[PDB]
Design an enzyme around this catalytic site. Structure first.
Site, PDB file in Angstrom:
ATOM      1  N   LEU A  45       0.860  -1.168   0.000  1.00  0.00           N
ATOM      2  CA  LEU A  45       0.000   0.000   0.000  1.00  0.00           C
ATOM      3  C   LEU A  45       0.898   1.219   0.000  1.00  0.00           C
ATOM      4  CD1 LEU A  45      -2.779  -0.939   2.605  1.00  0.00           C
ATOM      5  CD2 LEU A  45      -3.202  -0.306   0.226  1.00  0.00           C
ATOM      6  N   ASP A  46       0.440   2.287  -0.634  1.00  0.00           N
ATOM      7  CA  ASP A  46       1.168   3.538  -0.602  1.00  0.00           C
ATOM      8  C   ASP A  46       1.334   3.997   0.847  1.00  0.00           C
ATOM      9  OD1 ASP A  46       2.294   6.010  -1.237  1.00  0.00           O
ATOM     10  OD2 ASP A  46       0.307   6.951  -1.237  1.00  0.00           O
ATOM     11  N   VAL A  47       2.431   4.697   1.116  1.00  0.00           N
ATOM     12  CA  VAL A  47       2.723   5.200   2.452  1.00  0.00           C
ATOM     13  C   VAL A  47       1.548   6.005   3.018  1.00  0.00           C
ATOM     14  CG1 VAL A  47       3.962   7.197   1.502  1.00  0.00           C
ATOM     15  CG2 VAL A  47       4.352   6.521   3.872  1.00  0.00           C
ATOM     16  N   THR A  49      -1.619   5.590   2.135  1.00  0.00           N
ATOM     17  CA  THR A  49      -2.876   4.868   2.017  1.00  0.00           C
ATOM     18  C   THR A  49      -3.138   4.029   3.263  1.00  0.00           C
ATOM     19  OG1 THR A  49      -2.808   4.784  -0.409  1.00  0.00           O
ATOM     20  CG2 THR A  49      -4.248   3.205   0.705  1.00  0.00           C
TER      21      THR A  49
END
Ligand SMILES: [Cl-]
Ligand SMILES: [Pt+2]
Ligand SMILES: [Pt+2]
EC number: 5.4.99.22
Length: 187
Positions: A45-47, A49
């Site tokens: 997951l994106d930082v 997100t």
């Protein structure tokens, strides 16, 4: 040996790497320390997100889950800055062209309405990096907060708080191994 699966509610600001030589928070810091096995992230997951991230000790199960032979919906609860024009919604639902070629939201439902900032629940079937942010960006709308709340038939556990994890029982685990055509565990 035995196939274990965790469901983690990733907070914003946590990295998805196994360790950071700076001491910065990672999604592995609060996981239960096992031995004789290793947690493997089912995707990343994106930082910035938040939300559902599975971990499993089983390499084959992790493989088949982030590389499904069947298209899988991912559902996100999205908070956006300011009020969003209805035509922008039409664009997102009809499609736009971004840096990695065209993309679109398979579903857009307006959720809650917090002051001037709005909530939408959206789904998509691809999963290119930061696709949700870039989608709203291409229409002129900045994303405030982004929570992943469902991957296919797997939603965030109800009780589960921000930054916590829950271990799946044998039945839930086997449900996963079944959705991926793996033999069921017996213990
Ligand atoms: Cl939040
Ligand atoms: Pt991955
Ligand atoms: Pt969040």
């Amino acid at each position: 040996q035995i196939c274990r699966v965790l469901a983690y509610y990733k907070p914003e600001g946590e990295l998805c790497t196994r360790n950071d030589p700076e001491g910065r928070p990672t999604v592995f810091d609060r996981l239960p320390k096992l031995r004789g096995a290793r947690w493997i992230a089912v995707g990343r997951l994106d930082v910035n997100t938040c939300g559902l991230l599975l971990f499993t000790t089983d390499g084959e199960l992790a493989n088949r889950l982030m590389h499904p032979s069947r298209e899988v919906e991912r559902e996100y609860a999205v908070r956006v800055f300011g009020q969003v024009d209805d035509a922008k919604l039409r664009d997102l639902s009809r499609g736009v062209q971004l840096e990695d070629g065209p993309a679109a939201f398979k579903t857009i439902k307006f959720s809650g309405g917090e002051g001037i900032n709005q909530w939408y629940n959206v789904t998509l079937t691809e999963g290119r990096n930061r696709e949700v942010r870039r989608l709203w960006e291409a229409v002129g709308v900045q994303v405030s907060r982004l929570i992943r709340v469902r991957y296919g038939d797997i939603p965030l556990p109800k009780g589960l708080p921000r930054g916590g994890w829950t271990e799946l029982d044998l039945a839930q685990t086997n449900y996963l191994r079944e959705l991926v055509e793996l033999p069921p565990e017996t213990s």
